[PDB]
Design a protein around this ligand. Structure first.
Ligand SMILES: O=S1(=O)N=C(Nc2ccccc2N2CCCC2)c2ccccc21
Lengths: 292, 258
């Protein structure tokens, strides 16, 4: 008795609404307390309108220790993973991520200090609003960028990659869609490519997209392709696509595998392509396609 | 063992409050009623994401608010940003995109902002809020990787070739290393530029890259430059296979003056 009203004591004195703070097991209250003051400690090591910052993010903030403990998660994680901050805080990153990515995650938690990777994480938010249970969880790829820091720590923001079917962010005039086989051969792309890069969608069909990006970017794209195949979504580095009549445009493309929903085999790649420049060096030609 | 994890819980909470078992749980809450914060989160954004907050009125483009994190991000005094518009802060070819993302929900785009005349690629993520409308957004630097432009600025150039040896791609550096404009190499087989006495040599290596896939072979041979001088040159070549299908996309060469 005397111990329960003190558990509700600290519950309603942790930075949470009375609402959620009411219903917690005390093991949870522990975990949340300990991670909260641990977080404040690291952030003391860092410094020396919350709705705004929190709501303007297309991802969530995680700080994860060297052994995988998620000592902090921003409160908007529910809006992307469905899993609540209260449910994951203090538990192992290794219990909510695709096991095949564990060695990669383990490899990013250790020892420069900048980090950029892709991580499949349990997700219980059905695109619609409704939330489902942990047994019925989907794997969602997260694009994680951040810093390792000291006693090691990883501080990342994890944005989901928008799935090109279900988009509720407007696209502008410098963004065009494209469809690829699994080997990345062109099988569809927007008409705006004509204005943007000069190609007619007619002529790229059947062409390997490996023939239109500047060779100096190969190292990156390949891994992007490989990543896109093993986890199903990628955000590429910026790279140069060869324009039609010489020159190039800077491009950044979100790629995603779409599966046939009848037999479940992977059908293709859908690429959202952000054009980052007007055609540069229009006089130089790089490939035999531009010579014509 | 459940009580064991409970005991470890209380034991290392005690470890982080420097200031018995019934007492420590009531004692602890005194320790942080003394003290998550807006500013803390903002520092996190600067650390994990390198981003700054900013609110602009979305018809004037006039920035109504800038996080001080602008200065760490873009080497930009706050005093600059506040009291200007976003079109001033963005590359003149991104004014179009800007004007479209800013017209009468969520918003997300990429653009090029100035620093303290150099530009950087900024990932802007935010939402439009009423206030007659203002966009509040976060601008994040290096969300991604930059393109390698080391052929724009030497004694090497990379080229792509088909299985036959046709130059299908050559970077801009060739004009400096062999003197030919790109147009004068592409479409022609590499062995057309090779001194006759070395042509089989080159040929043999093209037979082996296309047979020893994953291994880089190197051949040295003489190259006809635009001025017709035989330039000795080593070529390191490997054959580039499609990561999905293994279909051999092309051969990759770095052609280096020797
Ligand atoms: O300039 S490209 O012809 N190479 C592209 N992407 C690419 C090429 C080769 C390997 C992988 C990829 N990606 C990039 C992102 C995921 C898959 C690409 C994508 C859309 C339009 C035009 C082009």
């Amino acid at each position: 008795s005397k111990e329960t009203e003190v558990f509700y004591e600290l519950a309603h004195e942790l930075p949470l609404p009375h609402s959620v703070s009411s219903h917690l097991d005390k093991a949870s209250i522990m975990r949340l307390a300990i991670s909260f003051l641990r977080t404040h400690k690291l952030l003391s090591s860092v410094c020396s309108m919350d709705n705004l910052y929190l709501k303007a993010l297309e991802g969530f903030i995680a700080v994860v220790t060297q052994d995988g403990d998620m000592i902090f998660l921003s409160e908007n994680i529910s809006k992307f993973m469905g899993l609540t901050q209260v449910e994951l805080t203090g538990h192992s990153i290794f219990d909510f991520t695709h096991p095949c990515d564990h060695e990669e995650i383990r490899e990013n938690l250790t020892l420069s200090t900048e980090r950029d990777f892709f991580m499949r994480m349990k997700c219980t938010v059905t695109n619609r609003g409704r939330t489902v249970n942990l047994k019925s969880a989907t794997w969602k790829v997260l694009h994680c960028t951040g810093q390792v820091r000291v006693l090691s720590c990883l501080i990342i923001m994890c944005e989901p990659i928008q799935h090109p079917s279900h988009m509720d962010i407007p696209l502008d005039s410098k963004t065009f869609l494209s469809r690829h086989s699994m080997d990345m051969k062109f099988t569809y792309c927007d008409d705006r490519i004509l204005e943007l890069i000069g190609y007619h969608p007619e002529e790229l069909l059947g062409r390997s997209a490996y023939e239109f990006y500047h060779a100096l970017d190969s190292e990156n794209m390949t891994k992007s392709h490989q990543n896109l195949c093993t986890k199903g979504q990628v955000v590429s580095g910026q790279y140069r696509m060869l324009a039609k009549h010489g020159g190039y445009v800077a491009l950044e493309t979100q790629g995603t595998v779409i599966y046939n929903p009848r037999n479940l085999q992977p059908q293709c790649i859908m690429c959202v392509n952000y054009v980052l420049s007007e055609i540069e060096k229009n006089d130089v030609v790089f490939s035999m396609d531009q010579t014509e | 063992r459940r009580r064991n994890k409970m005991t470890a819980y209380i034991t290392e909470l005690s470890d982080m409050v420097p200031t018995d078992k019934l007492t420590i749980l009531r004692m602890a809450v005194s320790h942080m009623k003394s003290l998550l914060t807006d500013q803390e989160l903002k520092h996190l954004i600067l650390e994990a994401a390198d981003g700054f907050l900013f609110i602009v009125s979305c018809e004037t483009g006039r920035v109504v608010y800038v996080s001080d994190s602008v200065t760490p991000v873009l080497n930009q005094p706050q005093s600059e940003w506040f009291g200007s518009t976003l079109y001033d802060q963005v590359h003149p070819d991104d004014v179009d995109k800007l004007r479209e993302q800013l017209s009468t929900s969520r918003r997300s785009f990429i653009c090029r902002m100035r620093c303290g005349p150099h530009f950087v690629v900024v990932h802007c993520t935010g939402y439009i809020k009423a206030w007659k409308f203002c966009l509040v957004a976060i601008g994040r630097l290096q969300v991604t990787s930059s393109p390698n432009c080391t052929d724009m600025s030497p004694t090497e150039f990379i080229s792509r070739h088909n299985i036959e040896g046709i130059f299908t791609f050559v970077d801009h550096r060739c004009v400096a290393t062999v003197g030919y404009q790109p147009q004068e190499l592409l479409g022609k087989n590499i062995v057309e530029f090779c001194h006759p006495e070395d042509q089989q040599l080159l040929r043999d290596s093209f037979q082996q890259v296309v047979k020893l896939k994953g291994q880089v072979l190197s051949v040295m041979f003489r190259f006809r430059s635009k001025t017709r001088e035989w330039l000795w040159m080593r070529t390191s070549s490997f054959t580039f296979q499609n990561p999905y299908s293994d279909e051999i996309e092309y051969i990759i060469c770095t052609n280096t003056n020797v």
